[PDB]
């Protein structure tokens, strides 16, 4: 039967990893997105930011694909993002997908914007 | 009551700032997008491109989130984009949100593609 | 009469060009996406990856806009993408749009993620 898709745009802080905003396209109670972990490399030149998305839709199985980009007021810093953890499989109800990003150290104030492309069905 | 979302993909010229195309996903009369300003830095190494989006939907209040990327036939130029003006707040009817981008000088022909993620309600 | 939009996220391999996954947002039989060509530059420092999208929707004419990004577990490589072939025009039934990308040589395992923004009508 029923099939649904949603796009959720998450703004997170590049220094603490904290989530600043969860912005739903067309869904707020259907998913829970949370910081799992934010660790510096011992060099301090990179940052590892790890997030989880939990399917909270009773009845539904979900797929999740992602895109992420650094949002910054400067233009001189490296903004490549390395993908680490990435759950490409089905995500049952109350199961989580984990999405990890390796980012270069950013200037103060820089943000990580993560786009979750959700495809769910019963 | 009613709630709506739209994605609008705008192609603008990196040298003049002029808008080449307003491409609506699922909306053409609901919004007006326009160049406000295009200024070189006195160094001439960067470009400041500023756009406005006006809510034209009678009854509706809107949120707007953005993504932008340089579209270019080369691969050797810096394509980092610095975010400047960015209206994250509610946008009432006939109110505008202003979105400003700091870009590096690009080779001839390069374009700025701006994605507007619109979430409107009554 | 009727009007429709779809987003299709394609994962392709940066070394062979092969398509790993066609991920439809809200469509699987409406379009066919295929590798046309993958060629090294004789320098071997760049890669030219060319794809076709065929409209398979009986009755429909389509527009297609694209976004592409390198998905990689590292952060040290150039990930600029040069746009080459790009069909901006109408695409009739069983007509194809061709989309070509110039990418820098990537580390093993790196992927090209192409986003097709489809707007179709009768």
Chain B residue closest in CA terms to C2: B26
Rounded to 5°, angle at Cα A96 from A95 and A102: 165
Technique that determined the structure: X-ray
**Whether C16 contacts C67, CB under 8 Å:** no
Q: How far is CA A102 from the centre of its chain?
A: 12
Instruction: Show the DSSP H helices in A14-60 as ranges.
Output: none
Burial class (CB in 10 A: 0-12, 13-18, 19+), C61: middle
Distance CA B28, CA B23 (A): 8
Chain A residue closest in CA terms to B105: A75
Distance CA C116, CA C118 (A): 6
A vs B, Cβ pairs < 8 A, gives 38
Q: What is the strand order of the sheet B61-71 is part of?
A: B19-25, B3-13, B111-121, B61-71
Q: What is the resolution of this structure in A?
A: 2.5
Q: Is A67 on the interface with C (CB under 8 A)?
A: yes
Q: What is the strand order of the sheet C31-40 is part of?
A: C31-40, C46-55, C96-104, C82-86
Query: Which tokens sit at A8?
Result: 């959720």
Q: Is A63 on the interface with C (CB under 8 A)?
A: yes
| Residue ranges of domains in chain C, CATH in brackets | 3-121 (2.60.40)
**Whether A109 contacts A73, CB under 8 Å:** yes
- Which residues on chain C are in Cβ contact (under 8 Å) with A104? 75
Distance CA B99, CA B86 (A): 5
Query: Chains meeting B at 3+ CB pairs closer than 8 A?
Result: A, C
SS3 B45: coil
Burial class (CB in 10 A: 0-12, 13-18, 19+), B25: buried
Q: Is C25 on the interface with A (CB under 8 A)?
A: yes
Query: Chains meeting A at 3+ CB pairs closer than 8 A?
Result: B, C
Q: Is C80 on the interface with B (CB under 8 A)?
A: yes
């Amino acid at each position: 039967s029923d099939s649904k898709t949603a796009t959720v745009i998450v703004k997170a802080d590049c220094e603490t990893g904290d989530i600043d905003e969860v912005y739903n396209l067309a869904v707020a109670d259907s998913f829970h997105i949370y910081k799992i972990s934010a660790t510096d490399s011992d060099s301090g030149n990179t940052k590892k930011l790890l997030y989880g998305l939990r399917n909270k839709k009773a009845g539904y199985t979900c797929l999740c694909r992602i895109f992420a980009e650094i949002e910054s007021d400067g233009i001189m810093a490296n903004t490549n993002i390395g993908v680490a953890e990435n759950n490409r499989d089905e995500i049952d109800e109350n199961e989580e997908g984990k999405y990890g990003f390796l980012i270069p150290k950013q200037p103060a104030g820089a943000k990580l914007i993560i786009y979750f492309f959700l495809n769910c069905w019963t």
